Amino acid sequence: MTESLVLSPAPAKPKRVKASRRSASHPTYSEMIAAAIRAEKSRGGSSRQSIQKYIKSHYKVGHNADLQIKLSIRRLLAAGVLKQTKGVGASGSFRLAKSDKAKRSPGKKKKAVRRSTSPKKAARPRKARSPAKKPKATARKARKKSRASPKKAKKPKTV
Amino acid sequence: MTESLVLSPAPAKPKRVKASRRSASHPTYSEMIAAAIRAEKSRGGSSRQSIQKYIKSHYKVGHNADLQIKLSIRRLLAAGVLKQTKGVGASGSFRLAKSDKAKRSPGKKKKAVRRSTSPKKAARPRKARSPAKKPKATARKARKKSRASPKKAKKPKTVKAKSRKASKAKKVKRS
Amino acid sequence: KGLGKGGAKRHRKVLRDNIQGITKPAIRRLARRGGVKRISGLIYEETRGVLKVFLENVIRDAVTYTEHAKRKTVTAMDVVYALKRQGRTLYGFGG
């Protein structure tokens, strides 16, 4: 009767933006986590806060859906839909059984880099040497943004 | 094979017409199957000849595809995304796990469309059959750059937005 | 004086034999005699209470047999009888 009574807030708050809109489709409280956890950048999975910010966009109500996220994830776990690796440092573990990686794999997995210290190390020994003065990474946009790829700095310059 | 003798003289020719970030190009071998399945609309999945015809478009691995495609498909089944349906009338299912799974869903089918990554592909049949005006999709910024929040996803194309910024009622009236 | 190894003297008190009843090492060795690896620390207070109850029960029986014998001396036989009555029945020495 949960599909007739407590669902009645759905033809009220989701009625505004969440529907079978031909311009752009929207979830139906059963296909939400896919957009969050497949168009994903994380390496060990999504987290509670991550899926929260991913799924709040206009149509999301959240009146009591904070409970229904966990309840539906546990229902899908009982049904056998998702697969997860244990972790504590990561705030979450929600993922899918992806085709790229086998179910059997060793614990060690690759490395990464950020290169955020490179702009600062462009000036740190530049202090030791003569030409040390005001920032000059990408001209005035270095002061404006402090991080710009060649094309990302070219485009505003020509525009 | 990843960097062995098979692909030691190989990479020179890809530099000509391979997958380039400029506009759209030939999908990588790891993703041509996914693109073909997304293009296919069959509820029961794509058959063997259906997959072959769908990836036959332009340059491909068709020289050794007869074994390469089957080996890759078995590799992905060993992981678990490709779910299959049982039968003999259809050559094969090879379905991509896209919607909610493990539910019965007895004979339920509706006109469906997604938002996550479909729009870039879905803007192509618009070119194929009937031209556009941009009342569909998510602007040119979606296909120009993937990592874009809605602000810069919308603002380069149209300056007219909802009550959050300016007033889109005029564009809505003008259709 | 100082906290560490002082010049004159260190480590302990001189007054004795009126507030005693604590043996910290002995509980460790008995715990090791029980085959354990760690003791969890806060067991000295409990073991002393556990110890006192055990001796209270046997001595109560032992002093009860002593009163019947009409003497001020507590002997091994009475101690054995007290343990035997309650089921401990320490064989030990009885002859």
Partner: protein
């Protein structure tokens, strides 16, 4: 290194045949308990050793029972919980 010689202590203490509690504190301990019940009680050399041996063996038996309580709770230490449970299950507590 922590806990290494604890295993070594098992080998020595389980083939040694001696008493671990200090005898002189135990000698004054039996007098204090007995004095409250009745006054002017004279002890004997055999009485002290007989009383001490039963108490030490009782502790060793109790500690072994608490050892099985630690492994039951995925533990290596004897918390006061182990002793309390062992006394109740064995029926010695009441």
């Amino acid at each position: 290194r922590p806990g290494t010689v604890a295993l070594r202590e098992i080998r020595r203490y389980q083939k040694s045949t001696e008493l671990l509690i200090r005898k002189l504190p135990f000698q004054r301990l039996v007098r204090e308990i007995a004095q409250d019940f009745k006054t002017d009680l004279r002890f004997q050399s055999s009485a002290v050793m007989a009383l001490q041996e039963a108490s030490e063996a009782y502790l060793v038996a109790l500690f072994e029972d608490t050892n099985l309580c630690a492994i039951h709770a995925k533990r290596v230490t004897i918390m006061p919980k182990d002793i309390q449970l062992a006394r109740r299950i064995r029926g010695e507590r009441a």
